[PDB]
Design a protein around this ligand. Structure first.
Ligand SMILES: NC(=O)c1ccc[n+]([C@@H]2O[C@H](COP(=O)([O-])OP(=O)(O)OC[C@H]3O[C@@H](n4cnc5c(N)ncnc54)[C@H](OP(=O)(O)O)[C@@H]3O)[C@@H](O)[C@H]2O)c1
Ligand SMILES: NC(=O)c1ccc[n+]([C@@H]2O[C@H](COP(=O)([O-])OP(=O)(O)OC[C@H]3O[C@@H](n4cnc5c(N)ncnc54)[C@H](OP(=O)(O)O)[C@@H]3O)[C@@H](O)[C@H]2O)c1
Lengths: 180, 181
């Protein structure tokens, strides 16, 4: 507790499932929480975006890059928080954009600290994937405290965090193939 | 609806998700509904086994073969209902048992009618939703009304039911490989 997630799709919902199964309290921010809540694990509290971001210290940004700027109205609430960029760009997106999605996200929310994590993990692995601790997540970011928070979370969820350095490493991390 | 599901695992949970996304009301029977409910889609009503099987006309049996007989105490409530055997046996289990899982389940609950369906569909395919051409669900069973009920459900979920005949076809259906991506 309390971990935030912005977004309502397959990845959001799988993250929520894993977090709840790992003893975290979870709040989800959706544009249509009424509709979205129906499919989410009951233990997660699905609410409006504004209200979902205010409590948590760590917020997973489980939306596509093209929708990042739509979150700008949440800036005053998000101030000083940890944002997790989970995006797994296609080969073409990766090559088209000079900066990583994670760096782009950092630029949009300069008062937040961004950690890149979970891009190489499938939604089904999140849902089902055995809590053997064998499955590696690469993790980077500029802030050691933020990286530790996300790494401990990864461990509690049964993954094995691998430190890949500063947020400048996010471009190479975003090139890593999704497993599997 | 309401559609029933017995069991609390990855498959139960995925079936539930999918059913609720397709406009069905869903009730789930678990031995520990307090714990189990936490992970299930909010729109599903997770409750005790006895209470779960009491309302619905069609009940998905999303537990392993080895646990089928543990459901015998529910016999009185399950009488006259449609049971869906979704099991995907391992090659070994398939070869060790003379009869199919579905036929075994039919023998345990003779006042019920069993339909074999969904064994070839992965839990993730249930969750994420089918997409072409990964839509095909083999169905068999002895009773045309029961097969129609399950087939319409399949169609509502976005699958394409394929009639494989009587419950005697279930052994061959159970040999069908499970499909992923
Ligand atoms: N699925 C995987 O196996 C996988 C693996 C690794 C990483 N990821 C990453 O997770 C992120 C989301 O993926 P997904 O598979 O969950 O996609 P998805 O199913 O399409 O979900 C996208 C979500 O974006 C949210 N969103 C917020 N603002 C939006 C807007 N303005 N327009 C459209 N949508 C908006 C939506 O929630 P609301 O409408 O309720 O706000 C929606 O649920 C992506 O960056 C992806 O690379 C996915
Ligand atoms: N997962 C897939 O991709 C896949 C695909 C097709 C078919 N299936 C089929 O779906 C069925 C279940 O699969 P699953 O992946 O959901 O397995 P699972 O995660 O192990 O779930 C089995 C469930 O059986 C229930 N159960 C009822 N009585 C039990 C007992 N006495 N002892 C132990 N468990 C008992 C449990 O729920 P409660 O504790 O609440 O009772 C448990 O959650 C299997 O026959 C499988 O072949 C799975």
């Amino acid at each position: 507790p309390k971990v935030g997630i912005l977004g309502s799709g397959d990845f959001a919902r799988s993250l929520a499932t894993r977090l709840v199964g790992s003893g975290f309290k979870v709040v989800v921010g959706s544009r249509n929480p009424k509709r979205t809540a129906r499919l989410f694990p009951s233990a997660a509290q699905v609410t409006f975006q504004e209200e979902a971001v205010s409590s948590p210290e760590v917020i997973f940004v489980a939306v596509f890059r093209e929708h990042y700027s739509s979150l700008c109205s949440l800036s005053d609430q998000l101030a000083g928080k940890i944002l997790v960029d989970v995006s797994n760009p296609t080969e073409q997106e990766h090559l088209q954009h000079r900066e990583s999605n994670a760096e782009y996200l950092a630029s949009l929310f300069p008062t937040c600290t961004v950690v890149k994590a979970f891009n190489v993990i499938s939604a089904w692995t999140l849902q089902a994937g055995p809590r053997d601790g064998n499955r590696q997540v690469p993790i980077c970011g500029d802030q050691p405290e933020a990286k530790r928070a996300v790494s401990e979370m990864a461990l509690a969820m049964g993954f094995m965090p691998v430190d890949m350095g500063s947020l400048a490493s996010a471009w190479e991390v975003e090139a890593m193939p999704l497993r599997l």
